[PDB]
Amino acid sequence: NDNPIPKSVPLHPKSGKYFHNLHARDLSNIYQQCYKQIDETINQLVDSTSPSTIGIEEQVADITSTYKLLSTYESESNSFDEHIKDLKKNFKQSSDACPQIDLSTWDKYRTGELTAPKLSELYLNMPTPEPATMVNNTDTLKILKVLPYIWNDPTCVIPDLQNPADEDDLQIEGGKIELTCPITCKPYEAPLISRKCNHVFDRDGIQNYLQGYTTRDCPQAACSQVVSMRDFVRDPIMELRCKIAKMKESQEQDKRSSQAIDVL
């Protein structure tokens, strides 16, 4: 009507060139660089704070909030790109469905009696991104959450699935997790744990037990299962505990020696 400017027209092959050219610009490299940066910052912070200094809980909470915000950003960016591709597919299908303007179909579209899909309206009507079907649980997040307790004491039992207060009401009765293996009187240089056994092993003597037998029972108690080589994975918690224990024992030995010399 009036000025012959139709609201929308069917897609053209020349316009199809640009439609295929249009894409959402990526953040995969940016996101992975950010993730690696925050992970290495957490790793540095693990031993960065002075052993006598206490109160890393607020910094841990702040870093947890930062990581959660980053993960939410990544999830909604994935939502962005999937929405973009779905919108492109819907628009191309609608354009293919609609006819082509040759003689007066353009006039009909201009008069408004005929309508064609418009990417602007579709992008205005696309649903807002939703952080659904996404879980903010990573190994870095887990170690970040559990590191304050390890800092407080090397032996801790954080899970509260059985009871929110502790493992059993107020008393854990969980014993201690020893850095030095009775089998191998040495710190765990290769901490390997099973998703089923949930026990950390040095693997130096475990390979000797697992050679010649396809599956062998877990030597530790409180469980009964057989595992192979490929069920073992690296557990950062174990060497985190080892490092904090060594650092604390070094600082306490230095303090006691210095005070004893000050006595003389």
Binding site: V9, L11, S15, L22, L45, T49, I101, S120
Partner: protein, 49 residues
């Protein structure tokens, strides 16, 4: 040394917050790039037709 370490930790957490702020600002830039571009693409299709 401990005071300097604490100051560096505070500085690095401040930079972490700053780069978190730059995050989703980069996403808003990405959205304002992809948006207002499809409208001009529609104008290009208008010209082509």
């Amino acid at each position: 040394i401990d005071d300097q370490i604490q100051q560096l930790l505070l500085k690095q957490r401040h930079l972490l917050s700053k780069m978190a702020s730059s995050m989703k600002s980069l996403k808003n830039c990405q959205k304002e790039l992809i948006s207002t571009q499809i409208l001009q693409f529609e104008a290009q299709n208008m010209d082509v037709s």
